[PDB]
Amino acid sequence: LEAQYRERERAETEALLARYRERAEAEAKAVREKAMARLDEAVALVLKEVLP
Amino acid sequence: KLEAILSQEVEAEIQALLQEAEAKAEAVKREAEEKAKALLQARERALEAQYRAALRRAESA
């Protein structure tokens, strides 16, 4: 019974994580791209507060 | 005739014994089966716990 229970979790604690890898990096890409176009606005906000 | 009585009296106790000794040979089989069930019902349950914990850990991770 253990023989078919230990190999159950391993075939899930691979699929589950392996799915997270697809989720994590796609959500890494999803935070960069939102930032990288609406970005100069940030640089602007900073500069405008250092040269006063 | 008497004596054949005495011999019809033994072959009677020596079924009483053989009836008593095969009404325990089940009792042993009952309590052994009612054991194994319970010796695998707790085991079934244990694997859930050891697996319910392992997959939650792997969700968080």
Resolution (A): 9.7
Q: How far is CA A52 from CA A44, A45, B33, B47, in A?
A: 13, 12, 87, 66
Q: How many domains does chain B have?
A: 1
The answer to whether B49 contacts chain A (CB < 8 Å) is no
First to last CA, chain A: 72
Contact B55, A12 (CB under 8 A): yes
Other CB atoms within a 10 A radius of the CB of residue B47 amount to: 16
In chain A, whose CA is at the least distance from the CA of B51? A9
Contact B50, A13 (CB under 8 A): no
How many angstroms away from the CA of A30 is the closest CA of chain B? 21
First to last CA, chain B: 91
Contact B55, A14 (CB under 8 A): no
Q: How far is CA A23 from CA A16, A35, B22, in A?
A: 10, 19, 66
Q: What is the DSSP letter of A38?
A: S
- Residue positions of A in the annotated binding site for Ca(2+)? 49
Query: What are all long-range contacts of B3-9, with beta carbons under 8 Å and residues at least 24 apart?
Result: none
Query: Of the candidates A1, A2, A16, which has its C-beta nearest B58's C-beta?
Result: A16
Q: How far is CA A14 from CA A10, A21, B39, B61, in A?
A: 6, 10, 31, 12
| The pair of three-digit structure tokens given for residue B35, joined into one six-digit string | 């054991």
Segments forming the whole domain that contains residue B10: 1-61
The answer to whether B58 contacts chain A (CB < 8 Å) is yes
Q: Do B58 and A13 touch (CB under 8 A)?
A: yes
In chain A, whose CA is at the least distance from the CA of B57? A13
Interface A–B counts its CB contacts (< 8 A) at 23
Closest C-alpha to A2, from B36, B57, B47:
B47
State the residue for tokens 């019902």. B41
Q: In angstroms, rounded to a whole number, what is the distance separating the alpha carbons of residues B57 and A12? A: 12
Q: In angstroms, rounded to a whole number, what is the distance separating the alpha carbons of residues B30 and B28? A: 6
Q: In angstroms, rounded to a whole number, what is the distance separating the alpha carbons of residues B28 and B5? A: 35
CATH number of B48's domain? 1.20.5.620
The single-letter code of the amino acid at B53 is: A
